[PDB]
Each structure stands twice: as C-alpha cells, then as structure tokens.
Write a protein that binds this ligand. Structure first.
Ligand code: FDP
Ligand code: FDP
Ligand code: FDP
Ligand code: FDP
Lengths: 316, 316, 316, 316
C-alpha cells in the first residue's frame, strides 16, 4: 500500500549501480535476510546437539544461506573452530564474519537477541582464498546486525552511512524505516555490567563515579544494561549514551570477539558518528592475529567516550 | 529448518549462472514476488477509484515493483490503455505482459484468484524500446502465474520446464514444493461454462455430448468450472483434464486476452506436456496485432485436446 | 491500530447475554474457532501410503476442542463410524455434527475447502446421550461453515439470522464482516456436476434445459461449479443462484450426508431467506434413522428453488 | 499439524469448571487475550505533536475488550484519572487494574514492554461499584503480565500458582509453555538503576555493596537492568535474583504504582515462592487510599529479599 516500497534489495541494488557493480553484495544480503527471517521466526515461537541447538541451527542456516549466493569465499562464526572456505564453484569475492545468535542461551527470559555481521572483500591474487584475509575492521565494506526484540530490525552500515529497516511480518520484507542516522553528541545513559566489573574495573571506576555523583553542574546518568551486545548497542544508537565492556579478567580483555562483535558494531557507531575505543587502542584499526581473538570495547556518543579517554590518559 | 532451503531466487539464480547471464531475470522475479506477497496479503484479509480498487492497487504495485528492477523496458497490463515504457535510467532487457488480478471483481465469494505473466526480451537495436516488441508467445522466455487460494503458489515456466513454489507465510519466501512437473496424458475432467456457451458453441457441443454420454467403453467425464482462469487451469495442470473458453460471441472470440492470459498459460501447459489450441490455430504461434487482442483458447492434457481437434477437423 | 474489533466471541456473547443461563454456545464456538484457525494455517502450508491424512488429524483436532469446552456431550464426524459420546466430567448441554475437511480430497489443486458444523441441544435427558439426542431435523440451534479460501471465512447461521466473520490473519480473530446477510431472491447461476449426472439426471433435466436454453428472450444462466460444497454453497449465498445435488447412481441421490453436510447448509440458506428442498420434502424436515444418512440437496435463492419444484410437481 | 494444544482458555476453564458458577474469569481473560494479541502485532510494526500515542490507543483497546466480556464493573488505568465504572447492562462481578503499555516510552530502542493486569472481585454490593470495590491489597483473584519481547509471553498468576503461555504467532493462541513455575531460592543477579539512585539510595546501599564486593570468597552478583518492569520482573522470575525500586527523590520511593504496577507483580512472585516487600511492610498488605498511589517494590527470590530485609531491620 506503501507502493514505492523500499525493500532492502531495492536499496542495496540502487547503491550497487552507483559503484559499477557486479551483483554479489545484493545476492549476499538477499541470502543474509532469508536466514534472518527464518531466525526471527525460530525465536518468535521458541518454547513451543540438544541443550544448545538454536545458535547452531542458525549458524548452519547462515553458512548454507551464504554459500548459495555466489558471493562469499571465507566465512567465520563463533561456532566454528576455524574458517570455512567456500567450495570453488560457489565462490565470490566476499568475506563474512558473523555471530549467528549473540545472546543465544539466555533467551528463555525473552531478552532481545541478534545475529551480528561484518563483510570484507578478498583483495589478494590468491592465497587461495584463505583465512589470512582477516584484516583490520576499517576495511569492512558492510557491517551491521539483525536485532530480534519487540520487532525485528536490520541496521546496516556501509560506506555511505547507517540505515534502519524493519521486517514487515505481513510481507516478509525488510522495509526502510529510519534513514541515514547519526548518534547524539552526548546523552543521559551509561551501560556497563556494574557487578564484578566494579571489583575489577580500570579508569572506568572513576568515569562511573563521575557519572553517578557528578561534580560540575549536572544531573546523574541513568544506568541500563540488558546483557546482549545487540540490545545494549542498538539502544545506544537510538538514544545516545555510552556502552563499555572491558572487565579486566582475561587481559586480552573482553569477552566480545573482535572480528564479529566488536568490528561490526564499531563500524556502525563510527558510521553514524560515535567513536569506539579500546580506551588506549582504537578498535577498527586494531589489526587481528586470530579469527577468534577477543577485544575490549567502549562505544557510543562521541563526547561521552572522549570523556572516558581523557580520564584514561592521565591514569594508566 | 528446511536449511537447503530452495527459495525462488536460489533456483532462478543457479539457472541464470548456466545461461551465462547478467542478473535481470532474477532481479525481476525478485521484484515480481514482492508484489505477489503483498497482493497475497491484500487478498487474505480483503473485507476488513472506489468500487474496483483492488486490481488497480495491484496493477500499480506490479508496475512500480517491475520498474525498480533495472530489468524491464515495456510493460503491458489489462488496466492500462496502452504500454508503459520504462524510463531510460531504470531500463533493462525485458518485456513483461501481465494481468495483475484475474478474477478480481468476483472475490467476495472467496474464489481463488491470480496474477498471470509472460516475459519477453527485446531483440531489437532500437525502435526505441517500443510496444511493437509484442510478438508470438513461443518467444516467451519465462511465463507463469501466482494463484491466491487455500495457499499461494507461483507456478513458473521457463525454457527448462515448469516448477511449483509455495509461499511459506512464516518466512515470506517461495519455496520449491513440486518440481519439473508434467501433465497427465488424458484425465477424467472437462471444464467449460456450460450455460450460454451451449446455445453458442462450435464443434465443442459434440465433444461435450461425447464426454457426458460416451459411446466407446467408458465412464463419463466429471465437470468442474470455477470461473477464474488461474483456478481452472492450475487444477488442469494438477489433475489432468481439459479447459476451454471459445464461446463464439465476440468472434475474435474469447474474452481472455492473448498476450497476458492465453500465452503464459499455454506456455506453461506446453512446457509441462499439454497442448493449447484455438481449435484451428495453435495459440503460442499466433502472432499478435494489438497488445489487447482476444483469443479463443482450449488447453490441457494432450490426448483430450487431440480429441477436440479431430472432432473439429471434420466439421467447420 | 484500530480499537474496537467485533470478534465472533463478542458478537455471540452480546446476542447471548440477552438470553443467558448456561447458554454454552460461546465457549463452544470459541473452541470451534481455535481448531478452524489451526486448520487454516495447516492447509495454507500443506505443500511445504497416505490415501487420507490431513483430514484425520483435523478430525482429531475438532473432537478435542469440542470436548474441552465443557459444553458438549455427543459429537458426529464423517470419519468416525459411531456417534462419539463425551465423558461425564466434560459434559455440557450440546450435540454437534461436523464435517472436519470437506474437499480434503482436492487440496492438491488448491480449490477451496471447509469445516461444516451443525450444533444441536441434547433434549431427552440422561440417556446418557448416545444418538437419540443427535437425530433431530430442523431443530438446529445454530449451524454454519468455515471456508478456507483466499481467506478463511466463518459463516455462523444462528437463530437470529446469518452473519459472516473473517479471519484477521494478523490478530488471530474472526472479525465481523457482514452483519445480517440475506440472499438475492433470484440469482443468475446454477451449480451442478453436469458430467456424470447429465445422463443420470431425473426431472432436473428440464430445469437445466430451461437454465441454458431460455424460452423467451431471457438471458441464459451461467454455469458455475467449483466442486467443493463449501465453495458452491457460499458463492450461491452471495451471487444467488441454484445449487444442486440430485445424483441418481448415488441413490438417495445425493452423495451428501444429512447431519453434517446437508443440514448445516439448509439451516444457513433458510435463515438467510433461501430454499433447500429434497425436491419432494423440505430437507430440513427429514427424520434421521442413521447418522451417516446420505440425501439430496437442492438449495438456493428462493424463486429459483421454487421454479424447479413447480417443475418437480409437474414431473413425478 | 499437532492436535491437542493447551490454549490459556482451555487451562483456565479446566481449573475453573472445578469451581464453577459465574466464575467469569474465562470470558474476562479470553477478552484480555484479544487486546494483548492486537497490541503485539501493533508493536511489532510500529516503525513501519505525538508525545504519547500507541499506548493511549492500547488503553482504549483494553477498556473496550474488558467491558464486552460481560464480566466487569470497575476498570483502572495509568492514563485515566478516575476509576472507570462500567454501565449496567455490561456489568459482571470483577474489578480489573491494568497498565496497558509499560515501557511505551522506550519502544524506539525495541527494549521489551508489556501489559500489567490485576483482577479483583467486586465485594461490597450495589455501591454501584465505584472505587471501594477497587482498593483491596493481597486480595487479587488472579493477576499477571504480557511481555511483548522476542515473542509475546502471557504469565497468568492465579490462586493455584503461576504458569506461562506463549503466543503461537501461527495459530492466534496463548499456548501453555510452563505449567507451575516457582522461583530459584536465591538468584545471582540484582536489578536496580544505580545511576540516579546510587547517590539517593538509603539502606539499600550496604546491600548493593555486598552484592558487588563479596565479603568472603563468594562470587559477586551480576548486574542486570533492562529498564522496563515487565522485562526485569520476568527475568528475575526465571534466573532468580533481586529487583528493586527504592527511588528516594520519587519519594514513597518508587515511581511504581500499587494497583497496576506493584501489586500484579508481587502477587506473581509470591504465588511462585518469592518475596515482595515494601522493605518495611509486605507490599501485598498495604492499603490503597488513592488509585494511582505510588510505592516501593523490592521483589525477588526468597533468600535474597530476606538478606536485604535483615539489613533493613538493622538499618532504620
Ligand atoms: O553477562 P556478561 O557475562 O557480563 O556479558 C554480556 C555480554 O556477553 C555476550 C557477548 O559478549 O554474551 P555471551 O555470554 O554469550 O558471550 C553478550 O550477551 C554481551 O555483550
Ligand atoms: O464467467 P465468464 O464470463 O463465463 O468467464 C470466466 C473467465 O473470465 C475471466 C477472464 O477471462 O474473468 P473476467 O470476467 O474478469 O474477464 C476469468 O475469471 C475466466 O477465465
Ligand atoms: O464431484 P461429485 O462426486 O459429483 O460431488 C462433489 C461433492 O463431493 C465432495 C463432498 O460433497 O467431496 P468428495 O468428492 O471428497 O466426497 C465436495 O467436494 C462436493 O460437494
Ligand atoms: O528509569 P527509571 O525512571 O529509574 O524507572 C524505570 C521504570 O520506569 C518504567 C515504569 O516503571 O517506565 P517509564 O520511565 O515510562 O515510567 C519502566 O520502564 C521501569 O520499570
């Protein structure tokens, strides 16, 4: 009824045309979305090997959906011990790193989940088409996540910006809702698991104290922490605030994996105007060593992160 | 859960690859399906300018959906007085003739309806990209219909055969149900509006008498006539029988338009092994004069139509 | 997002509060709506050793829901031989006759099919309940059918007249689509299987002659037979016309059973100002000797059923 | 296609037949399920001058359905000032307290939100009914909430205990997912807004210290606050833990209202073996002076609420 019905493909296709493309991006994202519709539905009536299962089901629906587009060539998941090289007949120019169901086993309490993804391009003659083509996050060409909450959103970041598409469940199509979004300069909210982290935090500790009982003319920051990277980062895009998970134990700290949680998220944030830092290191410019390596991340509104860095500079 | 999930695009894409393609077919059919999901839904809760409206809504959703694929160039509908030439920036190599909602105003009685389509290719340098590129139905490269009944089916015929895909409404995807289908040689059923036609029929009259009270060792044909070309032809593909609408008044007889009802349907039938005849003329090889011209059609199981022709030969 | 939807459940309740007591009809119909829903989505996906199956599972379904509305005592199927008698702690005052999936034998062509149901009130006391309480004629409390077509339509024929509901596929409800339907006095369509009936047809033959060949300047009646009773009765309830089943070699010349098929439909047509005759008697007045008792049904717009019966007086 | 689904409606009825009379709860809850459904699909598409809106239309919706189950007499909203008194010919025995859309003010980030509802039985007679009949404490007949998250979960807290239902998005029903849930005796999570509460927090401050900083070798409690009450109470019902609202500068230090927010949740936690204290008294035992009476709620797994209260005895 919406008849200049901007679907994702519609969008992704007219951007390709401008790049003097070949199609693979569009075929790919098309393939990506069918895994996302089926995953959205798997979840929307979930609770109707054995224990783990859902993340797996999804993992295997994203690998098989991405192989069939003749667009991918190396694929990396939380779930697989090492990269999977797409067979020669179905290869294409793209490298996809993704987390098929972040939050996965913690959805009984109906918490908003997600699939997160980063897309690279193979630039090399051949190696053949190897895992070593796992390189710094500022080389990403597309990145984003699919959120599964009250409604299902595919937030997508590319060279030209960040766009928000929501699944219309009545036509099984992702339609452009929010367009070319930017993040608020600063904003009333901070997010960090304030338990344990408090006994183990760095200069975070002070920024937190500062955001609770402020010194200069203020009113305190509201705290919020869902416990799903996709739920706490998307809110941060939507309202403006800060998100951080550095937690010191594990020193390749974090818990969140660089290639597929941190670098899509950071790419989005930066493309919408936020900054994402390790505190000392800037996350999209860290160059990886392992496909499964772990990174500290802090992301959100520019001003607020600037704030934690200025604290961090005159500390250790 | 189905994970070698054969969607339409999946299918249409691996066939293109073999043809050493360019993409437009797939982009197109992709565009076609989004109009079909939205039309399926418009109908599935219909009854919840003014009087006519639905066929129109659909017409305008199929034109706008086909223009956005950079694949079409001339488009022809029941609804539009004359062809629409796709604007230069959005053009592609294909010509689509289609009936956006055959049956349209007769759906209050919840009768199964459909959108029917034929796809041509422009072979000419330029004319520019004109309506005259409306040529004989055996030149079609793709043809088929979307049925809207108990469930929603996109039956699609191409050079390699006829395939059946059903809409899974839980993932808004058309999935391959029935594959590479052929029609039964002969079969117990005939379809013709047996009212009026009886006071106005040709050698039909006798074939009908013959199918009611048979002479040689038989048992009578069951009659069935829904009154939607898509409903009565799809059953005919599915069970095997004969369908005919010649009705003599209008002598460019028929009522069904050649370019978009008769030639998709005939193409499907023939591609699945049936034959479709004007009785005297063979329908896909009739060459058109008008985009909106009318043709007599008889279609279905080979043997049964052969039967009406052999009657028709030794008559007028 | 439009705040006052007239669910079947509301409507039944507001007509029924204005009666009250243990007028269990509402939790009876409310449970009927849950299996009819359940069936509809099953049928809209059946496609995505068995000579019969989806229909025996519908059978199972209907029985279970009927029984758990502590509203029932004797149930009647096409499949189950014997009348099924509900057990003590789930008993309530009604007897319900139903055909769980008319046309399950034509799903393959996606025709149009439905659930027929006739409710009765257990009259004679503590029998406990076994078949006496089930064999009235014109004593139906409320009857009607579910049509699973383009959309799922539930027509309820009550004491007060006939209304139609639609399954709002989006909210999970049968919303009121027409409030007090009444048939066209004479229609323009005749529904009969003129194949293997034409030779075996009795008096009715003069009748079809006069419907095709018009004995004046009158314009001939249009043939229309979908071949699924839910489909032909409902179309005849909306565009008028005559529908008939006079089968001869199905010898109480009807294939159609009284308790489940014929009786619910004749109670709908009659509560909407239409006629249903056996051709000798009125179908509503026949007395049941056995549950699965076949019979003939001629039902339609009034002045047409009459036009046939005065032929039938003349005739035999 | 799996034949015996335990709809909320069946369950309520089978526990309730085993009570009987005018135990109207079933057409009351049955009508509650239709607006909760209706809301869910609205919220799953709100995205595809207004400082407030979807929630005033939910308000309108709930009121209308409540009233048409001829089951109600006094309704209580967050939006409407006064208790709304049902009119004579639609009156039935119950008083229902509800918050139509907790978190409507966070939809934009797709958090998780819900409908809270508390039912009461109009006690003192023919008042007619206006607010006396509405202000009990621990006298709730049944209460509970709708969580619109990944999926829509309806938790019903009854006399017999707590069970959870899921909206089967495909058949239009709340199917039984867990039959008699009881909380973990002590959880491992604490839910509180430590931002603009930390400085204003009273005794509760020692409590959060001892939940972060563990005074032994004990492992610290993990922070978790989604910031939408439906979301934090339900997660605390499944992984255990303490949830709290002690607001100080929201001065009966709680933002949360008793009749609609606090009371339904404390009746669920308690019927599932969990505690809800005001910190001085038990929240269930406070007496209502006005309908929109704010209050504090600490609710959780038993041995944790206790661990806080013995601090509170010590404290003040
Ligand atoms: O609850 P904790 O352990 O503090 O961590 C939350 C984070 O962990 C995540 C990923 O980092 O899940 P997970 O435990 O499954 O690995 C996300 O849900 C979220 O970003
Ligand atoms: O009912 P009649 O007039 O005999 O014709 C049925 C035929 O007409 C069709 C198209 O030929 O519809 P329509 O009247 O809208 O043009 C189809 O429904 C069907 O093939
Ligand atoms: O095709 P015939 O046998 O003449 O009768 C049609 C009737 O048969 C029905 C039941 O009455 O199905 P079925 O062949 O499966 O028994 C309906 O489809 C229809 O009303
Ligand atoms: O964020 P604060 O104001 O501290 O309180 C959170 C509570 O507020 C609620 C209602 O209690 O929403 P709201 O801000 O719209 O009033 C819930 O989301 C939640 O339980």
């Amino acid at each position: 009824f919406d008849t200049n019905i901007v679907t994702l493909t519609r969008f992704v296709m007219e951007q390709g045309r401008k790049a003097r493309g070949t199609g693979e991006m569009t075929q790919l994202l098309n393939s990506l979305c069918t895994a996302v519709k089926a995953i959205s539905t798997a979840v929307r009536k979930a609770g109707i090997d054995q224990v783990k299962k859902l993340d797996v089901l999804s993992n295997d629906l994203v690998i098989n959906v991405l192989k069939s587009s003749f667009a991918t060539c190396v694929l990396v998941t939380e779930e697989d011990k090492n990269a999977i090289i797409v067979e020669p007949e179905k290869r294409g120019k793209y490298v996809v790193c993704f987390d098929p169901l972040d939050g996965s086993s913690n959805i009984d309490c109906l918490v908003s989940i997600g699939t997160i993804f980063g897309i690279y391009r193979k630039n090399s003659t051949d190696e053949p088409s190897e895992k070593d083509a796992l390189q710094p996050g500022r080389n990403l060409v597309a990145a984003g996540y699919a959120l599964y909450g009250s409604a299902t959103m595919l937030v997508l970041a590319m060279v030209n910006g960040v766009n928000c598409f929501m699944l219309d469940p009545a036509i099984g199509e992702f339609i452009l809702v929010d367009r070319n979004v930017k993040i608020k300069k600063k904003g009333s909210i901070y997010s960090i698991n304030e338990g344990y982290a408090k006994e183990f935090d760095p200069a975070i500790t002070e920024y937190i104290q500062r955001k609770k009982f402020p010194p200069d003319n203020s009113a305190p920051y509201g705290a919020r922490y869902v416990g799903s990277m996709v739920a706490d980062v998307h809110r941060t895009l939507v309202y403006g605030g800060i998100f951080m998970y550095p937690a010191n134990k594990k020193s390749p700290k974090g818990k969140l994996r660089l290639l597929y949680e941190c670098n899509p998220m950071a790419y989005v944030m930066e493309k919408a105007g936020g900054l994402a830092t390790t505190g000392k290191e800037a996350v999209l410019d860290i160059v990886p060593t392992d496909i499964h390596q772990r990174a500290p991340i802090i992301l959100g509104s520019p001003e607020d992160v600037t704030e934690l860095l200025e604290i961090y500079q005159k500390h250790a």
